[PDB]
Design a protein around this ligand. Structure first.
Ligand code: CLA
Ligand code: CLA
Ligand code: CLA
Ligand code: CLA
Ligand code: CLA
Ligand code: CLA
Ligand SMILES: CC(=O)O[C@H]1CC(C)(C)C(=C=C/C(C)=C/C=C/C(C)=C/C=C/C=C(C)/C=C/C=C(\C)C(=O)C[C@@]23O[C@]2(C)C[C@@H](O)CC3(C)C)[C@](C)(O)C1
Ligand SMILES: CC(=O)O[C@H]1CC(C)(C)C(=C=C/C(C)=C/C=C/C(C)=C/C=C/C=C(C)/C=C/C=C(\C)C(=O)C[C@@]23O[C@]2(C)C[C@@H](O)CC3(C)C)[C@](C)(O)C1
Ligand SMILES: CC(=O)O[C@H]1CC(C)(C)C(=C=C/C(C)=C/C=C/C(C)=C/C=C/C=C(C)/C=C/C=C(\C)C(=O)C[C@@]23O[C@]2(C)C[C@@H](O)CC3(C)C)[C@](C)(O)C1
Ligand code: KC1
Ligand code: KC1
Lengths: 169, 169, 176, 172
């Protein structure tokens, strides 16, 4: 079930707070938030690879603002370069996802999609893949803000952090 | 069970004409038309996306008629630029499809193929994917009609518009 | 079963010779020959489409004979241009495949693999794709022979026949 | 079900030393080493094919050593061209896989991944693929030795030897 989906070999039940017995009814929101934050962070980590490999959409993001796709910085100042008529489009389409299509109020996590559209019939398979989504969500949560404090402390995006050899601590 | 396949969440069963509680014996063919109109219109919306993105087949469609693939229009007049010996090859091959291979008299829908060649083996996610085929079919039937109406109103294709900025009526 | 696997809708059980009850014991090899011929002719049709689309390997087939891959004719004289030490390698590898690995004396064609490595557990779906393999094999058997006689009766490969606009029969054609 | 996983056609059970009932106790490790040596060699003959086809990573492996990916030899001396600060990075990461992530302590060879993520539930489906992993692992062990031996007995790598037409055993 859902409360043994977070455990793994090298830590087990890692509750250093002791909140699994302190707030036992609040686990199912907190699991749904940890899964939600992980799913955003894994898309954010992979997004930082693709931005900093200079893979661009080869066109104009806003011809009214004269803003090409390669006119947008890859690092922290990338979302700030998007015009406010474009951030209105992101918040409108993802209001229809987060409220109607795949509502974040649904704490189950499963939507109609499966794992690549596939329901996993074997319960030790499915719980294993559920553990990977949490663990790769946990590694990317700390990973994505290891990448944002590597830029708000240096003032240097992840491309020329590697070009100038500035990964020396 | 074909009677609850069209009914999705936000509107439920939707019958402003009341023809489910009207004639019940005409539903099996009206479902067969709605699914068939959906499948034709979904391949047409993808067709308008590929044609307006200037993805062509790199050659001559009719070297006797001196027609390159890049000479065919990408709007509603693209099908009328095809030579009459080319429209008949479309007509006679899809006579073999519509009458023999995937016979349109089969009001069931399932000819031989499934979801990428397989049954889904599971009455809840198969009914979920049957809901998606109808709902994405319904959104594309309005989508291809809206693509053709503003084609003939503006007189432009979907690449000429988005080059002039015609986004407000 | 195997006796029900070749029959589909517009013809059903189709034998003008009537050997399904004249020779009922010779059927299970004759199915395996039809399936083998179909499997061979399906790769031969896809091969002719690939050769005449000028998809070549970018190199030298035999640098000893100065023979590039693009120097090989894309028609019925393709393997007549392969050097004889090259056809020895093809015959030696498919001796290992047609006798040891996937032996052709196994008269059900069921060697190790499934349909893309999948065993189709549904018997009505497995019989459907077994019918497709036979029917696409029967269509490619007529497809490869009508491709081969159209080349030798025109003297042109399939690229040159569609370059000259020679689809119309100078001889006499028969096609769907 | 591990004593019949290497048994295939013509050889069947093959044991010229007779260790299968000289040591029926040490088979569980000895299978796990054969599977591990098979998996390492299978990713090695594929490596020699990729390197000798000049598929490189179009950049600098070590800009500190001023060394790009196309400067490394594509033969047996390619591991020596890597700087030791970089090859320390790969034994630091494969220490994490061989001890922690997929521990080679586990004599099954079985970890959370299956065959392309799927568990094969038909039992000679699964035993057919387990036989294939062993057999292609065994053929790659004899393949990666026959590549490294025939390189040093001609001095050329596999790209160099095939370009010179040095396939037939003239000097040997
Ligand atoms: C998005 C935030 C978030 C939330 C809500 C959770 C929630 C949970 N974690 Mg998870 N965890 C997270 C991120 C999160 N985690 C990250 C990023 C890692 C990698 C370090 C982990 C590593 C981890 C392990 C190994 C395990 C859990 C477990 C749990 C469950 C324990 C129940 C409980 O109440 O624990 C206490 C409550 C919390 C852990 C969440 C409270 C969030 C605090 C208040 C945030 C405080 C700010 C923080 C210090 C800032 C750090 C960022 C900075 C380093 C840059 C609970 C569902 C256990 C489990 O799932 O067992 C079934 C378990 O074994 N977590
Ligand atoms: C490490 C990568 C990874 C892995 C192994 C998984 C694994 C999974 N995802 Mg997750 N996911 C990930 C990253 C990952 N995810 C990322 C980065 C995102 C953001 C794009 C998501 C967004 C996502 C959504 C929106 C959903 C999943 C769901 C699932 C689960 C499907 C299992 C199932 O058959 O449900 C049971 C099957 C059914 C109920 C019927 C469907 C057939 C499976 C555990 C599904 C779920 O509900 O999760 C628990 C689901 O809806 N994932
Ligand atoms: C998720 C794991 C993770 C990994 C692999 C890294 C990796 C790195 N960090 Mg980061 N970091 C992380 C998370 C991570 N970080 C987190 C969670 C924090 C706290 C928010 C930091 C805070 C941090 C700072 C302040 C700095 C690094 C720096 C570095 C680089 C140091 C390289 C070295 O040789 O020493 C290296 C790329 C250094 C750097 O920025 O190099 C460019 C550096 O100055 N890290
Ligand atoms: C090919 C056209 C077509 C047909 C034959 C059907 C048939 C059906 N739909 Mg409908 N549907 C369609 C297109 C179609 N749909 C489109 C484009 C949408 C998106 C707007 C929908 C949205 C929809 C929902 C949400 C639901 C249905 C449902 C149904 C079924 C219930 C019976 C019924 O309502 O009869 C009434 C008759 C009809 C629906 C079609 C008759 C033809 C009309 C009278 C022609 C009028 C069109 C007008 C002249 C031009 C259109 C204007 C403009 C859009 C261009 C029936 C099988 C219900 C269902 O499946 O329950 C299980 C259901 O819940 N449909
Ligand atoms: C490779 C040769 C070959 C062989 C050995 C078979 C064998 C079979 N076919 Mg198949 N068939 C083939 C090719 C072949 N077929 C081709 C190319 C087509 C498409 C035209 C078909 C269309 C077909 C259908 C629709 C059906 C069969 C069926 C059968 C089975 C019925 C048993 C019987 O009495 O058949 C009769 C015996 C033979 C067919 C083998 C005799 C070979 C002849 C005498 C060789 C002479 C041909 C001649 C030179 C062709 C010249 C023209 C050509 C170059 C264009 C048997 C396994 C039936 C079935 O599977 O039911 C269980 C069935 O319904 N066949
Ligand atoms: C498998 C299906 C198939 C298809 C799609 C074709 C298609 C074709 N054939 Mg081929 N053919 C086939 C099988 C096929 N053939 C078989 C099984 C044979 C006997 C081995 C032939 C023997 C053949 C000859 C001898 C010729 C063709 C020719 C042609 C071309 C023109 C046909 C025409 O317009 O004549 C009119 C159609 C009819 C009179 C029948 C209606 C056309 C590309 C001709 C060609 O290549 O043009 C130069 C040509 O000369 N075919
Ligand atoms: C809504 C929908 O329909 O979805 C459907 C369809 C779909 C998409 C096909 C399905 C799927 C499968 C999916 C989504 C598979 C993808 C999963 C994903 C995206 C997994 C990333 C993990 C990243 C990690 C662990 C990073 C650690 C980060 C670390 C260790 C760092 O140090 C961060 C880093 O920055 C620094 C700090 C330092 C740099 O020197 C190094 C880098 C740059 C790394 C679904 C989900 O099943 C259902
Ligand atoms: C994961 C999942 O869901 O399962 C999947 C996988 C699975 C099971 C396989 C399924 C299937 C069915 C599939 C994929 C069927 C595809 C069939 C296919 C691909 C059929 C090609 C015909 C091309 C021909 C006959 C060429 C004719 C000949 C031609 C065009 C010519 O000779 C002319 C030409 O050549 C020259 C002479 C000169 C050139 O300059 C120009 C051209 C090229 C014009 C599913 C159900 O779909 C889904
Ligand atoms: C025959 C056969 O063998 O099939 C086999 C093999 C095969 C193919 C592998 C299998 C599969 C899977 C398939 C077919 C998956 C494909 C599904 C498909 C093709 C789904 C499109 C949806 C489009 C929508 C909802 C558009 C809305 C359009 C809207 C909302 C618009 O506004 C229209 C638009 O123009 C305007 C008006 C304004 C623009 O600003 C926006 C655009 C441009 C959009 C099968 C089916 O299982 C079995
Ligand atoms: C965690 C992220 C990460 C960073 C940020 C990072 C950085 C550098 N890598 Mg490392 N690396 C991995 C991860 C990371 N590496 C992983 C997962 C593996 C496979 C297990 C791996 C393998 C090698 C090899 C073979 C070499 C190598 C090198 C460098 C060097 C390049 C700059 C330079 O050399 O001027 C910089 C410091 C080369 C080298 O160290 O040359 C002296 C080299 O030859 N890496
Ligand atoms: C079975 C093999 C086969 C051959 C050998 C063949 C050959 C030619 N096709 Mg055809 N074709 C199909 C199959 C075959 N075609 C199929 C299955 C379809 C869709 C269902 C199809 C569609 C179209 C369309 C839309 C057009 C078309 C054309 C030509 C013409 C080149 C022009 C020329 O030589 O003058 C040559 C002879 C164009 C045309 O007819 O121009 C007057 C044209 O517009 N085709």
């Amino acid at each position: 079930s859902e409360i043994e989906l977070g455990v793994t070999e090298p830590l087990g039940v890692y509750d250093p707070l002791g909140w699994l017995e302190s707030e036992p009814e609040a686990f199912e929101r907190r699991r749904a938030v940890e899964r939600k934050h992980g799913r955003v962070a894994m898309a954010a980590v992979v997004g930082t690879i693709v931005h900093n490999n200079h893979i661009v959409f080869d066109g104009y993001l806003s011809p009214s603002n004269n803003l090409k796709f390669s006119d947008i910085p890859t690092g922290v100042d990338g979302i700030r370069a998007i015009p406010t008529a474009g951030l209105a489009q992101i918040l409108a389409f993802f209001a229809l996802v987060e409220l109607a299509w795949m509502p974040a109020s649904k704490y189950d996590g499963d939507y109609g999609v499966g794992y690549f559209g596939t329901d996993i019939k074997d319960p030790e398979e499915k719980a294993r893949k559920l553990n990977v989504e949490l663990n790769n969500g946990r590694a990317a949560m700390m990973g994505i803000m290891g990448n944002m404090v590597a830029e708000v402390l240096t003032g240097q995006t992840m491309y020329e952090q590697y070009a100038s050899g500035h990964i020396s601590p």
